[PDB]
Symmetry: D2
Subunit: 333 residues, 4 copies
Amino acid sequence: YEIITLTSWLLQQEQKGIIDAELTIVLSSISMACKQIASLVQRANISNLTGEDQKKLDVISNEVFSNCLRSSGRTGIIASEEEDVPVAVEESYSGNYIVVFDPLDGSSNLDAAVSTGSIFGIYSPNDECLPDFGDDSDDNTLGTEEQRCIVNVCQPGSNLLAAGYCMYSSSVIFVLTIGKGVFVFTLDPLYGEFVLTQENLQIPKSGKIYSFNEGNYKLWDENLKKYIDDLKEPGPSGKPYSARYIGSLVGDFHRTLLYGGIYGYPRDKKSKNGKLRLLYECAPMSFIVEQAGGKGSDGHQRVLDIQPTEIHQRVPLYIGSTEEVEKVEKYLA
Amino acid sequence: IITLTSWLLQQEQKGIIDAELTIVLSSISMACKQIASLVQRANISNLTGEDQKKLDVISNEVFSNCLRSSGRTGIIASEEEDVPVAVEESYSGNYIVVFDPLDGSSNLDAAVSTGSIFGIYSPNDECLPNTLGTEEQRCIVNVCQPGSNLLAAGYCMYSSSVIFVLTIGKGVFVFTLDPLYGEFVLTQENLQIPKSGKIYSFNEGNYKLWDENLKKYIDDLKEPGPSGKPYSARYIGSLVGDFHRTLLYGGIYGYPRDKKSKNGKLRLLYECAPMSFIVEQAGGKGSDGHQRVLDIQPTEIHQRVPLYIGSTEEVEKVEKYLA
Amino acid sequence: IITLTSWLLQQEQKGIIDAELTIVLSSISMACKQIASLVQRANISNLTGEDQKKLDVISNEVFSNCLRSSGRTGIIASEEEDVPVAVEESYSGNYIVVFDPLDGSSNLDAAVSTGSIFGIYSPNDECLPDFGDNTLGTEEQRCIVNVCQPGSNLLAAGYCMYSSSVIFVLTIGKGVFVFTLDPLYGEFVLTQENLQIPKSGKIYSFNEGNYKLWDENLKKYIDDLKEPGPSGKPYSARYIGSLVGDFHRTLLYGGIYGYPRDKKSKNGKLRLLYECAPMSFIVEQAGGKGSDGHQRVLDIQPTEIHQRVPLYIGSTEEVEKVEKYLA
Amino acid sequence: EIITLTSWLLQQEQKGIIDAELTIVLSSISMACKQIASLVQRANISNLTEDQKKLDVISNEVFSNCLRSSGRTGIIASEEEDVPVAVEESYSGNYIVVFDPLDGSSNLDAAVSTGSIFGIYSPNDECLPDDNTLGTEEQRCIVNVCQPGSNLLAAGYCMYSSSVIFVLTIGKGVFVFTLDPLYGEFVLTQENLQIPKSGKIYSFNEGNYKLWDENLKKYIDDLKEPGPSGKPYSARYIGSLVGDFHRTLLYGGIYGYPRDKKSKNGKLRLLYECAPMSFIVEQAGGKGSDGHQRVLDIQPTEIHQRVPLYIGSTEEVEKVEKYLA
């Protein structure tokens, strides 16, 4: 009616029977973990007084997540293979839900200069993957067997129930979809609560803005190079495409969601299969974009049609406005 | 933990700055704290009341109120879509503060960050007699000479972190806002921008509108050197955001001229001058492609100029291609 | 660290409260966070006695906005030197929230502390007319007084104290829970479960300036408290003047608080429905007693619009002691 | 328009009223108070992972850290159920700050409010040198070095209640600063505060009535007499020295902590509590007495010397002195 907080909104969806009380608690706990991580990000410079500065924050953030979700279930960590961010996987005691949580969107200080964010996906599994806990088991680290079970149990195309992200920038924004549209919540610094600021967000069908790291231009295929060249051609009013690339996956994606356009992390000569991980990053983002009326593709097929088969599977990503993604797909055919 | 207040009082005690300037700097930081909050709650405030356009206006009012104990403030109205500038002139006639409330008027460019930019000058004449007229603007230009009477400069970035960067003539100092206690805390002393950095910040969407000079330089940055590793490209669209990242990690930022804008888009007095002074204090370079920005004296207040700023070796490289 | 939000969601899961009431309670705590800020900045906001009265009004508007998604709210105007009460009636007709924005209209009594008091009832009719002057008339006040019965349909009650610490005290029928606001993260954190007020406590809270206006009954009780027992230590006297502040201290450390009747106020000053009822329900859940000097406050059925009653509240043994003097 | 403590201090410095060194001391003290306020607000939470006494020690540490650029600080350990006092001596030897971190060591008395009290002196000598505690030789030095009657330059307190208030006097009036929770800065909300000449409000712990002298009992009894109209005095007693004093300063009246059968010389300490409060009240146009004489006129002899206190509106204090003669 006037002020709708995340708590009130979740309780309303529950009354409507859209989600159950258990999921209401999981989603509410995730947002609480995000409030704390936001604070960690804002004070990082200060905390470091009394560059692996972004790599240590990944770890502390995963511990904050674990503590906030201790009443729903146990949490394990899928260790970083390369320069990847370690992923937190929480499995409910009841066996009804599994939350795959990406604490921050990167491990680079440069890419986190102005923004960063958390990404999560909630699945409804058939199995129990995580074992028990430990007395002096300091390492939460999941083993080859447990990492395998999670990859097999979490299926983007058939059991992803909810997805969202929380952006930490000049504003702290919580974006969520429980299967019926995208909802945007803004954190009120004053009262420490997420306030509903946008319902049923729709990403524009088109937008003359492209987000790619053009420093890798000579490492791309001739397909992609021509697409990139043609965007620089002043079409109509004699106005070419605008280029914007923060380097922050959440920041670039959020801007694409609000103003339209296309974001891309293609494959190149060094990263033959791209860089973004299919299960941890691309799946949740693609589900969200599709709920907002957009498209998430790997250049040829729909990302959500790809079944994860490897622990750290990577894939190229073209996401954003439908007409823009369709345009890049025509050049890559 | 040294706060901005404690740090300012120590500089004053050292005779580096006088009490009056201590008050001006302290008031500016107070205005930035408030503007930061406005930016953080923009979405909510808009639920009950062109979003970055009126934020410009409210921010200028916050500035005026915080500096009312130092002097009076006038507003230099925006021509096109540009940001209205606040000019404060001390009652004593010793200082003039040129304040750019926000770094842009576009929602797109302010999606993740924005910021305030200011410069403090020691005038010769008294210009201020809400909006300043042509006669006052003319006076402001002749009085504020970036190349000789710019005493202090800085900016406040509003992003995942609220950062206050300041220079009073002897190095660059970085202050981070503690959300907890509402105070700026010194987190970096005598900041030095790296001499080189393989990162370039340009809007490549305008590539075909650039001169063949510049196109050549941009193309060569994509050549994987002897490591099979090209330059990285980063461009937020936020002047304060892109500049700050360049200041901490090195590289080059550029806002060149094009076919339809023979002189670029960034304003010389309001944006380029304070940024150039800061970069030079950190050991870097601020050029228009051929000369030092601080060597240029505006003839008109709204004068614009191309900008190439960042690491010394990177800026020297672009100058060589533009010769 | 269990926050109020997590705690409320846990009670809603156990089926102790329904989702609608979870929203009402969550909205009230939100309203209290905002009111706390208004109180902390009052001196500054006024740079732009009756500073307390104006705060009463703004606080009621904050309450209304935070509860607009649950129902409509009317205001029972401040006739005398009483605080205007906000009454919110849910759209569904299942709940009514009687909200006292601040505990007084005096600057003197709010020098160091103040607070909000509320009670949630499950009515048997509709009283709020319509809106969308939200002041409730004589007929609407009558309906509310009949519909709100502290002894049978008061489901939840609590208060939020604004002092050197911001404390939210709540009871949903199964014990008293204390939540402390973390200035840092803007969230109420559970700091005490199932609070129990001591059975006795040698501390009395009365305005002794009115001593010569009291009955000889009360004067005698007051006199005997000053007698140092065989330990050589008499009762300690503490009186802030803030109802919420004096009550809270009584709840944590024990003792007795009283606002008796006197020659000027033959029926006491505190209002039965808006102040005494919620306070008595809370004290009883913490293991104490709330009396009017002769009977249990919650046994008295509100029959008038501006009904007042004397109040003796606190530790069971202390309240039973004053009743023995007044009999 | 909006004046912060920093701007106000800098203006007094420009006016030559105080020197830069004192400007830093006062600025540093207010910084310690912002931190102590936060400790008080989160006490219940911090204790999750009796409570007033441990808070006394941490507060003194915060004070020491904030004043490390001005001088060194020692601690005068609690003799009984008192609060340990922090004494800071400037490196230059120009100033000594006597800081009482909290106004009590009782949880009951701090249920709604508490506060810090400080006094700044200009000594004729140099006292200070596991135990950052001052010894017998150092304690005997401070008592003789700090004379509230002649060398007390500035005094004030910071109240932690529903509002965080910083009250200060540098010799030319009392000034009130309110902390803005939002921007973390003290804002000037009242200049040259004047305590009313009379006030029909009294602040005493009447639970000790039968332990008082017949003098005082008579005074206390007569206040209950509905005089002229038919309205007797109002009674208000929080139990918090800073809280009760602050209310007396703004609305007038009388506050008293007399001597009783149990405490023959009163409970409040002369140097640490009564001296700063009396200086402030006199600057606001009020009176601070021990019942027979002006508190500031008395000279400390013992390190923890105590004295009865009657402080507040001039006419009210003069009235009690009339009954105690």
